[PDB]
Design an enzyme around this catalytic site. Structure first.
Site, short mmCIF file in Angstrom:
data_model
loop_
_atom_site.label_atom_id
_atom_site.label_comp_id
_atom_site.label_asym_id
_atom_site.label_seq_id
_atom_site.Cartn_x
_atom_site.Cartn_y
_atom_site.Cartn_z
N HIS A 1 5.13 15.27 -4.64
CA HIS A 1 5.79 14.03 -5.04
C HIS A 1 5.15 13.50 -6.29
CE1 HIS A 1 8.10 10.40 -4.09
NE2 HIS A 1 7.14 9.82 -4.79
N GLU A 2 3.81 13.45 -6.30
CA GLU A 2 2.98 12.91 -7.38
C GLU A 2 2.98 13.89 -8.59
OE1 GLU A 2 3.10 9.84 -6.57
OE2 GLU A 2 2.64 10.01 -4.36
N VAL B 1 0.56 5.96 -0.19
CA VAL B 1 -0.30 7.06 0.02
C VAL B 1 -0.62 7.88 -1.22
CG1 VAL B 1 0.32 7.18 2.37
CG2 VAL B 1 1.64 8.62 0.77
N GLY B 2 -0.01 7.56 -2.37
CA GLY B 2 -0.01 8.42 -3.59
C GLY B 2 0.54 7.63 -4.76
N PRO C 1 0.82 -1.20 0.00
CA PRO C 1 0.00 0.00 0.00
C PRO C 1 0.86 1.26 0.00
CG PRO C 1 -0.38 -1.31 2.00
CD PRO C 1 0.89 -1.77 1.37
N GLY D 1 9.83 7.89 0.10
CA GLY D 1 10.15 6.78 -0.77
C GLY D 1 9.15 6.80 -1.94
N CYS D 2 9.38 5.91 -2.91
CA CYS D 2 8.69 5.96 -4.12
C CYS D 2 8.63 4.54 -4.56
CB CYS D 2 9.49 6.72 -5.14
SG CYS D 2 8.63 6.87 -6.73
N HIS E 1 6.20 13.63 -10.61
CA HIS E 1 6.17 12.53 -11.60
C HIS E 1 5.74 12.93 -13.02
CE1 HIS E 1 7.26 8.93 -9.47
NE2 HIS E 1 6.48 9.23 -8.46
ZN LIG Z 1 6.70 8.39 -6.51
#
Ligand SMILES: [Zn+2]
Length: 192
Positions: free
Chosen positions: A152-153, A47-48, A45, A109-110, A156
């Protein structure tokens, strides 16, 4: 069939995604890409998620942070990060803007850079204008951890990952997460 998360090195993650035609937002097609995002996010799971991370070169982001995920983090770190739950958010063609020059520094993290963390400095306060999942024009004001995930999103969609905007000497395996920072690394936290 559910798409896989795409890993670093795949050019779709490093090039600028293209806008959804706002008249198209409510088609079964964009709705399916959206639903696929939501499911890949809840499976991880995380968050984004952004559309490029499932191989779709489009300006779409989803995010959610639940009471349940949050009740895993040290209660005091939840407090420093200003990490509060928020319902599932879908934004098409998000445009992000900070609301002030205040920044915070914490570990991210990603899903595309599996097993690693680094400290990344974010705007503490943002606004994101865009479209929700029914083609309606929305704006969103966000602070704390929510504003972090938005950035963060959003990053991308312009082909930017955090490993290219992290503080030196903080990159680390998940397992080394709690090890002390080296000398001359800034402290984690935020501006007054
Ligand atoms: Zn990411």
């Amino acid at each position: 069939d559910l798409p896989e998360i795409v890993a670093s090195g795949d050019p779709v993650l490093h090039e600028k995604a293209r806008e959804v035609d706002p008249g198209e937002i409510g088609s079964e097609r964009i709705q399916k890409i959206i639903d696929d995002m939501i499911k890949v996010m809840r499976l991880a799971p995380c968050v984004g998620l952004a559309a490029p991370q499932i191989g779709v070169p489009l300006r779409i982001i989803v995010l959610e942070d639940t009471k349940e995920y949050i009740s895993y983090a040290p209660k005091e770190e939840i407090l420093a990060q200003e990490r509060r739950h928020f319902d599932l958010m879908v934004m098409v063609n998000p445009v992000l803007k900070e609301r002030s020059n205040k920044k915070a520094l914490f570990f991210e993290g990603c899903e595309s850079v599996d097993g690693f963390r680094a400290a990344v400095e974010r705007y503490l306060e943002v606004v994101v204008t865009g479209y929700d999942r029914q083609g309606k024009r929305i704006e969103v004001n966000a602070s704390g951890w929510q504003a972090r995930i938005l950035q963060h999103e959003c990053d991308h969609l312009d082909g930017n990952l955090y490993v290219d905007k992290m503080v030196p000497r903080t990159f680390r395996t998940v397992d080394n997460l709690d090890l002390p920072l080296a000398e001359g690394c800034p402290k984690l936290g935020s501006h007054h």
